[PDB]
Amino acid sequence: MLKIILPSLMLLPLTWLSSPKKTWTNVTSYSFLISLTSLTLLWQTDENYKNFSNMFSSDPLSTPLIILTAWLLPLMLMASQNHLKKDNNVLQKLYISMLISLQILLIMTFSATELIMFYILFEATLIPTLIIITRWGNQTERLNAGIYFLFYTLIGSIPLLIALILIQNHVGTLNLMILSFTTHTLDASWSNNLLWLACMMAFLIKMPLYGVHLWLPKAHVEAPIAGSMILAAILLKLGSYGMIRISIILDPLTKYMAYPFILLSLWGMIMTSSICLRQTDLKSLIAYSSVSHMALVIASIMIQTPWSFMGATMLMIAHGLTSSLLFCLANSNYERIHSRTMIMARGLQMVFPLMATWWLMASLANLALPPSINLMGELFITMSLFSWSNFTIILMGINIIITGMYSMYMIITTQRGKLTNHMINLQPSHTRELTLMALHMIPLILLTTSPKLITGLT
Amino acid sequence: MNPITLAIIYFTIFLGPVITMSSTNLMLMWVGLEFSLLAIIPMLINKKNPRSTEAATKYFVTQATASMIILLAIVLNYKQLGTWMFQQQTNGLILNMTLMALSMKLGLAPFHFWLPEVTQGIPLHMGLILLTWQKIAPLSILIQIYPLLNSTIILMLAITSIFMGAWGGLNQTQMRKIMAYSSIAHMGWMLAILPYNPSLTLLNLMIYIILTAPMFMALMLNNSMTINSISLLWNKTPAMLTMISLMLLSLGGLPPLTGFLPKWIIITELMKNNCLIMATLMAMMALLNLFFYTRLIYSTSLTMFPTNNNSKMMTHQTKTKPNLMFSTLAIMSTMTLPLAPQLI
Amino acid sequence: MNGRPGHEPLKFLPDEARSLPPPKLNDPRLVYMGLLGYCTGLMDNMLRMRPVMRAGLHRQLLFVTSFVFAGYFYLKRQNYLYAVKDHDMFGYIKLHPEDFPEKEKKTYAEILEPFHPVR
Amino acid sequence: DGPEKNYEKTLAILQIESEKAELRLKEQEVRRLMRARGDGPWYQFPTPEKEFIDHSPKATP
Amino acid sequence: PFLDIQKKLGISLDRHFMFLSAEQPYKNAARCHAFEKEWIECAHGIGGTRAK
């Protein structure tokens, strides 16, 4: 997998060497094709996963993501052509390159055989992200948000560093292939009960768990649209990908060491879903929607039943695409409105007829409408959770009712009701804004036709 | 300085560490330490400002008593073994006093108080020589006595320095003070692996030298001893803003940059030796060091602090070209993690 | 390590390292050092405020060619050091055979790892 | 090119990684032994030169 | 030692006088010249870990 990567690196030379006026089209047009080369990995006509070479591999779980990581770089670069079009021609070429490095790094992290290669690349992605959030962040508080995003991930990260070096001494190689075909069975000691927490905690932090998710609402609030898309679509899912490949070892402990997180997540799912119900900042509501719909995932990567994992892989790819779509349209309202407040800007369909159709489909993806991969995902996690304990439906049942309420409230108070009297007149929709959306949903429609591809390893 | 004097002093400041390293007769190692003490004091008071005399008089007393303690260890050994050099048989207290005295010279941890105060009030150029060139001579003695020194003493010396260095950094805003508090922490990592992997002790030094030497020549390019002063870097010289950003995050352990390797292999070696108690606590507060590094990042790069009108005047006159080596060690630092296997 | 028999007290790479294969000049690493170098050059131009890529085309070369030169002769050594490590390591495994006996794991048929059910 | 290539490539990747793993662990055991044993070329700490002994009459027994 | 510029250069400015059995002026052997010799010709080729 060096075509999904080397051609990517070369994007950086192109963003720099290219003309200031033509820099945007060379980069966006080329990474669209970079995504097309990424599609070749999907050709798996056999169970044997594809070990491209010693360090680089792609199995069913990584492949559905590498393609998404390559896909969003085009979109990210199309959603940030407006803001970041007021810059000095060298601030742009830095932002474009920053976005380019994220997927170079993220493509490799999702396509990495050695778990510590994951760690080095895993924690590197913070550098590009923190720059995108802090340097271009509009609000006074991004310095703070950046600190929260760096420390919560970093304090979790050093325990994983110690744990992975620890297993290398215990087993003798951090190669995901071998670690899988070798006997690593923890022994339920008090210490192992700590190892397990060391490995999972760093992944559980960037996958916002109810206890440590305050970093994500603060980060996406002041982050620029491209950073918020990356955090929701690819960055948070880095934590899920890690939990799937790391729990191959630590096989016995999670049977009983998971209860704490599972309950934290399912109760967390309800409270995070509910506070979405009365949050005035739209970007705030989408972020907590992201916490709740990701709290379902940590509760399926821990129950560990084939369907859970399959539900998780379905939901992660699906929610990734949906969330961005929501964060992308939130930005389009923010740029004309100039405020994140949900109460202002009422009645837009009256003035932006189509964006409202995109808003409606994004919300229906947000809630579980049935001919969507989003529902298949939740339906499956719901099933397994029920298997774990029939009572789980109650808590995963209060979340479904709440999820319907906030998803439609975003449509009802942003895209319906009487028009706002006279905010700065809202200029019509650009074709870029609409495509950036179409590019998010057309793939959501196509993937829903053949869910097998994003079905996970299980 | 009459250029002749400059030569004699500089030769001594350079013959000082070199005799230490080359000789085996400890005595000759002691005088190497003594010559470094004598040579550094003249340069320290070059401005001869009231702050400077204070600096040198402290540096000298701290250095002198430690030098006398190191000599006492050699004198005692001479009577416990006729040899003029530490051996397997050496009484444990003999080595422990040597360990304490050289840590005094390095200002490793309990004696860490002298290093920030001495660094403040001496020119930045001499400060670089004080923090890097002066430090090599004491550690060379320790690398030689690697098997003999006791594990428990330096482990606690190392953990103490990580804690004190990190705490000192958050409160200090004086840039030169900040450079000293990182060197106390980095010195702690070096000694932590000293009884285990000396090669790694050395690596954790070179990388510190290849990181700090560019960082200081950056601080002086604009001669800013304040963060507020380095924050207006964007107006005085915009290009160094990019690398100053990466070098400081490299000084802390963040993974893509060269700075991770020293911490990573030291942790790998300590876990190989089973200190998974000690290594864990060190790595954790090591994370505190990055917080103050990033706070500076914020002021200098990620956010643009307001500047005075006279700054436009300094932009006008042609800027002093930074040194040829600033560029090479800036890329050597921050970009050599792919070359890590051959480095160790 | 040191103290190892025959150690060359101050030499860079003892001739014994002749026996090892020479590093291919295009070894990814030496090529990296090259890029590492080009960047140093470009960076310099930048810090000194010169046209970044169109200046010092002589220096550019000194850099890309100094770093690379250094590489071949360094890697040539680091390669030796690692090679000594095996000579040393493998030898000991034999000279002191009893301490590193060859274990003989049982075909899974025989071994009985317990099965924790997920249910 | 086929199922054959990845299957055979993955087995080659596993053999390199399995052999690297066994050696890395044996290093740690050899390095434990030579440090304490001191019977191997690594961890051979120095003692003074026999070379500078004065083997002469010295006007004394 | 750390940098053996002495063995390399062949010079011996610091090794001729490190032990009591080294050449004493006018060949006046010191006390113990007998033992230290017996101690250090023993521990020669045998590293410290096994000179102990």
Binding site: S53, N54, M55, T113, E114, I116, M117, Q168, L174 | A340, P341, Q342, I344 | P5, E16, A17, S19, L20, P21, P28, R29, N79, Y80, Y82, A83, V84, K85, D86, H87, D88, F90, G91, Y92, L95 | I16, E19, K20, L23, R24, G38, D39, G40, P41, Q44 | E41, C42, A43, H44, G45, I46, G47, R50
Partner: peptide, 27 residues
Amino acid sequence: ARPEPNPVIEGDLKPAKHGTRFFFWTV
């Protein structure tokens, strides 16, 4: 009698087995 000298590992160098075995460096 002096203590027997410790054994001498013998042979000729061969490129390191699998090269540097640092984490994930196929090198």
